[PDB]
Amino acid sequence: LDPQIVISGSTAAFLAIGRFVFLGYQRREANIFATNDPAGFNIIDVAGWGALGHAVGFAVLAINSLQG
Amino acid sequence: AHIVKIYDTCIGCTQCVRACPLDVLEMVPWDGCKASQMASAPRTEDCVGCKRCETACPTDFLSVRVYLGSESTRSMGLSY
Amino acid sequence: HKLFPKFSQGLAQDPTTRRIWYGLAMAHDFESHDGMTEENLYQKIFASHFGQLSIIFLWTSGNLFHVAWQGNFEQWVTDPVHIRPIAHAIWDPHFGQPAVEAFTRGGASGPVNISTSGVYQWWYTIGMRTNQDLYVGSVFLALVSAIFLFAGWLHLQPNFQPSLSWFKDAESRLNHHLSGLFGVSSLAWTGHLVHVAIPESRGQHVGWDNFLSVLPHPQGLTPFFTGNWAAYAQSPDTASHVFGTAQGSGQAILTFLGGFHPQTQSLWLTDMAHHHLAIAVIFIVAGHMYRTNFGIGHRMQAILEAHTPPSGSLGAGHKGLFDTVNNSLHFQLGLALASVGTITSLVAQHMYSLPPYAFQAIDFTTQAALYTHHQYIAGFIMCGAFAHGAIFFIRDYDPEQNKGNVLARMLDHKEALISHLSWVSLFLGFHTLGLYVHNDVMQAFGTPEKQILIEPVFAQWIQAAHGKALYGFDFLLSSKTSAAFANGQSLWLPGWLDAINNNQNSLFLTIGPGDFLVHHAIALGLHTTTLILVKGALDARGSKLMPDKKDFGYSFPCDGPGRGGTCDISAYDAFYLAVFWMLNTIGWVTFYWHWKHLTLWQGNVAQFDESSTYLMGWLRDYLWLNSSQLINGYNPFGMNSLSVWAWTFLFGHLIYATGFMFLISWRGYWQELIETLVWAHEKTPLANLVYWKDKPVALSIVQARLVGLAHFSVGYIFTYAAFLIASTSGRF
Amino acid sequence: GPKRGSLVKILRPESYWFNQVGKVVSVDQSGVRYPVVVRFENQNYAGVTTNNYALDEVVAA
Amino acid sequence: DIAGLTPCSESKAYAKLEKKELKTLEKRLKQYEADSAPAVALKATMERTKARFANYAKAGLLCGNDGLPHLIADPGLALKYGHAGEVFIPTFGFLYVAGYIGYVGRQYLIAVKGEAKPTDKEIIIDVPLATKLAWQGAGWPLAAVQELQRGTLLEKEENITVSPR
Amino acid sequence: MKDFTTYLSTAPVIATIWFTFTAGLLIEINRYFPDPLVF
Amino acid sequence: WLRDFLWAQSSQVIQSYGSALSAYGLIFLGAHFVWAFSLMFLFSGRGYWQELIESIVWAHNKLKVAPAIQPRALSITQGRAVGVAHYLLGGIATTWSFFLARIISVG
Amino acid sequence: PFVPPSWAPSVFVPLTGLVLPAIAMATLFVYIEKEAP
């Protein structure tokens, strides 16, 4: 199998989907300290969305490894 | 010593006073009821907490209340 | 006046013997001490929880030490079917030589006790093989107990006292506990299983010597970081595997097979490994939910303010409940005790039917002891949950900070609650008692064919839904053409089906009309105990007989003989009355459990099926019949090893009976008797030179209820434990 | 306040006859705090059938 | 059949229990005279025993592994397999007579509250009014659902409650 | 005679008569219809 | 006493079913029941029962079936009296059934 | 080197059965009855 492609693609997909379409909703519901990203997408946002990306990627890899 | 309180619903029927087996309560002048009499508890150090006063009171709810507090030799009714 | 107790000067100025008992009974009620503030309250609670931790680890280290020095653990592991586990040796100088001969059972030097606590199966399953491992564990846990005792001393010191803001920080505590204390501990236990406990069952020693040189899997961490996780499930243990050796062994460390190991009749170690790994990942994910000092996370008060439905069916919803859970400790203790009691019932219900440890469920006395132990623990903890809920209503409930939410609306319809609990209790009592008395009259008059035997078709429908092919419903796991049957068939169903269609285990036992009647008696006991406990929680603020009940507190004797008489009117007295029903209900569930398992273990389940539908069959075939070898423990012909359980059986009957004295006879008789005794001592010459320092009085009313319930419960527990252990160990 | 013989309804929540109906006996016209004398057909736990109430504790319903 | 239960007319332990009870009765019978009163009483007992076993095997009851009749309490399963006469028809018969008793008592209470001595009618029963309500209470489910639909079945919140309601 | 029927109208006398009637009705039903378990 | 008297001699009462002594078994169980039933009165107090009756009275008020004679919990002394009476009846009747079944069967 | 010797029950059981209960009950009885200054 291709572990690097699945993990990097899932991480890129979840980081992009949290960077662009779920940023403003997460800011509305919430209402380290400063980055120079223009949307305030700081380190802990990277950590959360990359954690979800690695989790879904390893879930896909495990379900593929069972072949089921 | 126990805690005995008198509330303003008292109608000065004197029933509580004549029910205490220890002479703790007494009637004082007052202007809040037609009888111009109110109970008072100046000697709660001798009160045992038998609650005969609460049984004798006619008002609903009670105008005399006994809250069992810290025990002494007088409040435990000990003759020894 | 006197010093003791140092927390209450109202008790310290008591000239009577009431001072000693009320200093003992009020020592740990810190909220009502002299000069108690809120920070001081939380600090003493934190140190007390350290003290409980140290006592728990010292208890476990003592179990390990007495097994390692006095047990037969290195001899038990070779033949665990025919060798009895030894708890601890007996040094009783009151013995005689027949007792020393009879308690020297085998294989021991002197008199020993045979353990029923089941620690040999648990320790042998998790990898213990020698006594030296148990000595190392005992020394390690004594060291951990000393560390927790020192930490309890340490966090009271003024440079180490936490602030009030540290205790009321709910999000940090749930995040750290759900992540660390649950998930990291379950992950580390998966690490223990994979690294030690699975290779010990394969016949390979893995200790602290060689665990950094023994691979748990022949390809270490390459399937884990490749994502080829199905490689760790390849080649599991064969169905002809001898536990603790390499014959019939496998290579896998994380399977999901279902059912039981064929020899030990217990769960697979790889299944428990992937169990703890899955829930470890789930708890570490769940512990990243709440908002600490990192910007992301949920805010619990915002969650509580959100969940309020339209149309006002819950009123203000969950508004204002964050300042009633976080500010109150009795609310938190009530939630904790409700959860822990239900989980303890869950532990008992899932450990009798799905036994986890190797050669458990062939040691029948261990099964009966563990089930009965955790069921009575769960019953006491549930009564404590409702008791501290009533204490919450009396002390901590602010009605202005709860104007319109769910908790005030419970007090608004409390009469409908208590009335419908009264209705289900009366219904279940009338019809369960009527069916039992009917069947007893049919058995007495010689016609068993007339007796009302209702078939439990709903729980049998559930058993057919789980895969049991005895009742012929054939749906969802019992039919071969089902979607759930076909989807689960490759992976976990072939073990579950083989284990559920066996009638030699406790996994989904065959049920019938006796099981019907007893489950409705159990529902009766639960709904009645819930009626008394809920009625004590809700009428704690006051009733119509006593509207100002919140002004007296939680535990006051009565309000006197006026207004018709008000005896047992406090919420404490409702707890007192509900402990009897808790003991009753757990007695019903343990009589039922024990007798159905005795008829399973003997072979004749037809005896239970024929005799459990009428109460004379209970009294004749479970209590009279299974107490023959118990009461023959000692006799005028000699004694044997069951004489200690016969003495404990009579001991429990005696303590029970002595508690009846405090429950029936009340105070003023005894106070007049003690006044005559005071006269008799002060007038007797040459003994009145000795004089008491504390004035003797009788026990108080609340103290009488507590002492009577205490003797009652201790005699109840000792009587049933003596009967259960003696019957199950003597006849097997 | 209310007149003699009229039916009233009690709003004192710690009373036995709260949310129930009685009959006014007399209303004292002095500066007494609880002038409204109401009899009830059923007795309380103390065997009493008469209580004194204030003006804002009775509603002629 | 249902839950692996055999019918009682097919069950063997049912016939064994029938034979065992007849054997006990004839062992008690064989120590008397022919035309004596204990003999007539025991022969009537044996006749009722045979009639009872024939009636239980006739009604289609389900027996277990011990030969005793088992009852089925599920409306659809019993209506499907012909077991409606053991729980379902008895539960609606009970609800008819229990609601009869409750409705007659409720009408007696509302009839006697409108007098100058309701308690005196509660101690000493008005027998003609009680018999009138007892005969009129046969249409209690119709009158019950009519009092339900008008809002006169319930008292409003003029009930007695505690200070925290 | 009016007072004797008033005494017969009292609660324990009517409870005795009514439970005698109800018990006797059940007894006669269980005599003429011996041992009903179904229907 | 527990084994050779009570346990041993209750054989006759516990196996009296299906014979003419079955009534002694029924009254054995019934007497045990009544004895236990007394403990509810002996161990409790009328305040709890009065409040329970308050809730039930509310339920009856909701359906217009509250009696004109007000439901009251038993008095303290009547609770004690009911307790001791059911206690005595239960125990004595238990020993009655035991004795009679025993001595009629082995006599 | 963990095993306590063979005479250890004959000393430790009467110790915590008689001597430490006696010292404990005596110290607690003196602590209960002590007058406050």
Ligand code: CLA
């Ligand atoms: C989970 C932990 C937990 C904690 C931290 C607490 C804490 C508290 N409880 Mg709660 N409670 C709990 C669980 C807990 N409880 C459980 C499991 C129950 C059910 C039993 C209760 C039921 C309960 C009631 C009814 C009350 C409390 C009260 C209290 C408070 C004071 C306790 C005290 O000072 O009495 C000191 C305790 C004793 C002196 C115990 C006496 C010994 C008992 C009766 C057992 C005797 C059996 C004996 C050991 C057997 C020996 C046999 C022999 C042959 C060897 C304190 C806040 C009281 C309160 O809050 O008042 C307002 C109170 O009234 N609790």
Ligand code: CLA
């Ligand atoms: C075996 C003894 C025993 C029995 C039968 C009961 C029965 C009951 N308890 Mg009690 N209880 C007991 C022991 C017992 N308790 C003890 C030891 C205590 C500790 C003090 C308590 C404390 C207690 C509390 C705190 C509460 C109860 C409640 C109840 C009632 C529960 C509802 C129900 O099941 O109705 C079914 C009815 C029965 C099982 C009773 C039998 C009724 C018979 C069948 C009817 C009459 C038959 C016959 C015609 C009579 C002829 C007699 C002749 C002289 C005329 C029920 C009456 C609760 C309650 O009131 O709920 C509504 C409640 O809150 N009990």
Ligand code: CLA
């Ligand atoms: C007290 C709760 C209760 C429970 C646990 C059951 C249990 C059962 N019902 Mg019964 N039933 C009940 C009360 C109950 N019933 C009541 C009050 C009625 C009158 C409305 C019925 C009327 C009824 C009919 C007409 C039928 C059942 C059937 C069944 C069986 C399968 C139902 C199913 O799979 O759906 C899941 C279970 C539930 C949702 C519980 C409620 C049951 C509802 C009321 C009926 C469900 C019928 C179901 C949709 C039809 C399945 C067809 C079958 C061939 C697969 C199951 C043993 C069926 C049967 O005979 O199977 C052999 C069937 O045909 N029931």
Ligand code: CLA
């Ligand atoms: C007179 C009719 C009558 C009616 C309609 C009701 C109705 C009710 N009762 Mg009440 N009750 C009654 C009399 C009645 N009761 C009597 C006589 C007693 C014993 C003193 C009780 C004691 C009682 C308790 C302890 C409880 C109820 C409860 C209830 C409710 C649930 C149904 C139930 O479980 O009853 C069950 C029936 C009984 C427990 C006893 C009934 C006895 C007989 C059969 C009825 C009386 C017949 C009457 C004398 C006939 C006179 C008519 C004639 C003069 C013309 C329901 C509102 C329960 C509740 O509150 O749930 C919401 C509940 O827990 N009742």
Ligand code: CLA
């Ligand atoms: C904490 C749980 C625990 C329990 C219930 C027991 C129980 C027993 N021990 Mg064991 N013991 C334990 C832990 C325990 N032990 C540990 C961890 C060790 C290693 C240090 C020992 C070392 C030991 C020896 C050498 C012997 C026993 C013996 C015994 C038996 C006789 C009682 C005795 O004299 O012990 C005395 C207890 C000790 C010597 C050690 C306990 C020391 C701890 C620190 C005490 C803790 C204090 C406690 C929490 C509160 C006390 C004060 C309070 C009561 C007011 C009895 C079965 C005797 C025996 O085997 O008879 C056949 C015996 O000879 N024990």
Ligand SMILES: CC1=C(/C=C/C(C)=C/C=C/C(C)=C/C=C/C=C(C)/C=C/C=C(C)/C=C/C2=C(C)CCCC2(C)C)C(C)(C)CCC1
């Ligand atoms: C700067 C910039 C940029 C770039 C960016 C990037 C490139 C980023 C990345 C980032 C990243 C790349 C991140 C990551 C993250 C990750 C993480 C944070 C992870 C975590 C993990 C986890 C958490 C895991 C876990 C686990 C384990 C350990 C075991 C198994 C199970 C699981 C899977 C669960 C751009 C160009 C756009 C633009 C310009 C600016």
Ligand SMILES: CC1=C(/C=C/C(C)=C/C=C/C(C)=C/C=C/C=C(C)/C=C/C=C(C)/C=C/C2=C(C)CCCC2(C)C)C(C)(C)CCC1
């Ligand atoms: C008094 C009080 C209190 C207490 C209370 C209590 C004590 C309670 C208890 C409670 C409880 C004790 C509860 C329980 C619960 C449980 C539940 C509710 C469960 C459920 C379950 C489920 C839902 C499941 C299901 C299932 C099945 C069966 C199978 C299939 C699958 C599933 C999983 C789905 C408090 C603290 C609040 C405070 C106030 C006062």
Ligand SMILES: CC1=C(C/C=C(\C)CCC[C@H](C)CCC[C@H](C)CCCC(C)C)C(=O)c2ccccc2C1=O
């Ligand atoms: C259970 C119990 C009660 C409740 C018991 C009560 C209220 C007695 C109920 C007796 C009957 C059931 C009520 C009266 C029935 C009437 C004759 C109504 C007619 C019913 C027809 C079926 C005849 C107490 O009042 C009490 C008081 C003091 C200490 C202990 C206890 C106690 O244990």
